[PDB]
């Protein structure tokens, strides 16, 4: 697996569904697809809600069964804990990979919780979080925020990842702005 974890805002923008849920059993491997399936109890829906209403089932999430092909392998302290899951719909099922934003709700900063519930949506239209994985890294557009935190050891806990969003500032220009 060589996928690069996305910024929380990109995770939000690219996902079909964003929910909170408990993981409520051990995963079962499907022998035919070699997809692993996890049962969850959903508690809230923050994206997709408008399209599904209160009729929202969502009981299973799917992921490759091998680590080599980017499978999500669940690792929680509290077996009872709620997780933000940001997932894609494929062939009718909700899918995650190891590069999905999946994390204990209680582990998110207040800024990130605001992002997932209110604000990230503001940026999906115009702005893009652009990667900066190695030294010579370039900003190539006014509509881009450069994710320089990607150079840090723990980049998901970086200032940009954890407290900022890439939003319109002026016509044709996006900037990292404080969520709080």
Swiss-Prot record:
Changing residue 2 to V: Normal interaction with metalloproteinase. SMART domains: NTR (SM00206). Coiled coil: none annotated. GO terms for biological process: cartilage development; cellular response to peptide; cellular response to UV-A; connective tissue replacement involved in inflammatory response wound healing; negative regulation of apoptotic process; negative regulation of catalytic activity; negative regulation of endopeptidase activity; negative regulation of membrane protein ectodomain proteolysis. GO terms for molecular function: cytokine activity; growth factor activity; metalloendopeptidase inhibitor activity; peptidase inhibitor activity; protease binding; zinc ion binding. The activity of TIMP1 is dependent on the presence of disulfide bonds. N-glycosylated. Glycans are attached at residues 30, 78. The modification Phosphoserine is found at residue 155. InterPro entries: Netrin_domain (IPR001134), TIMP (IPR001820), TIMP-like_OB-fold (IPR008993), TIMP_C (IPR027465), TIMP_CS (IPR030490). Gene3D superfamilies: 2.40.50.120, Tissue inhibitor of metalloproteinase-1. Chain B, domain 1 (3.90.370.10). The record marks 34, 135 as: Involved in metalloproteinase-binding. Keywords: Disulfide bond, Glycoprotein, Growth factor, Metal-binding, Metalloenzyme inhibitor, Metalloprotease inhibitor, Phosphoprotein, Protease inhibitor, Secreted, Signal, Zinc. It is found in: Secreted. Zn(2+) binds at residue 1. Detected in rheumatoid synovial fluid (at protein level). One of its GO terms (cellular component) is platelet alpha granule lumen. Pfam families: TIMP (PF00965). Its main location: secreted. Residues 1-4, 67-68, 156-157 are annotated as: Involved in metalloproteinase-binding. Disulfide bonds join 1-70, 3-99, 13-124, 127-174, 132-137, 145-166. Metalloproteinase inhibitor that functions by forming one to one complexes with target metalloproteinases, such as collagenases, and irreversibly inactivates them by binding to their catalytic zinc cofactor. Acts on MMP1, MMP2, MMP3, MMP7, MMP8, MMP9, MMP10, MMP11, MMP12, MMP13 and MMP16. Does not act on MMP14. Also functions as a growth factor that regulates cell differentiation, migration and cell death and activates cellular signaling cascades via CD63 and ITGB1. Plays a role in integrin signaling. Belongs to the protease inhibitor I35 (TIMP) family. Interacts with MMP1, MMP3, MMP10 and MMP13, but has only very low affinity for MMP14. Interacts with CD63; identified in a complex with CD63 and ITGB1. This is Metalloproteinase inhibitor 1.
């Amino acid at each position: 697996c060589t996928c690069v974890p996305p910024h929380p805002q990109t995770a939000f923008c690219n996902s079909d569904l964003v929910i909170r849920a408990k993981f409520v059993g051990t995963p079962e491997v499907n022998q035919t697809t070699l997809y692993q399936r996890y049962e969850i109890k959903m508690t809230k829906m923050y994206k997709g809600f408008q399209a599904l209403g209160d009729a929202a089932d969502i009981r299973f999430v799917y992921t490759p069964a091998m680590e080599s092909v980017c499978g999500y392998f669940h690792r929680s302290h509290n077996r009872s804990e709620e997780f933000l899951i940001a997932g894609k719909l494929q062939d009718g099922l909700l899918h995650i990979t190891t590069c999905s934003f999946v994390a204990p709700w209680n582990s998110l900063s207040l800024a990130q919780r605001r992002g997932f519930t209110k604000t990230y949506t503001v940026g999906c239209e115009e702005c893009t979080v652009f990667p900066c994985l190695s030294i010579p890294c370039k900003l190539q557009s006014g509509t881009h925020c450069l994710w320089t935190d990607q150079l840090l050891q723990g980049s998901e806990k970086g200032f940009q990842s954890r407290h900022l969003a890439c939003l319109p500032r002026e016509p044709g220009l996006c900037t990292w702005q404080s969520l709080r």
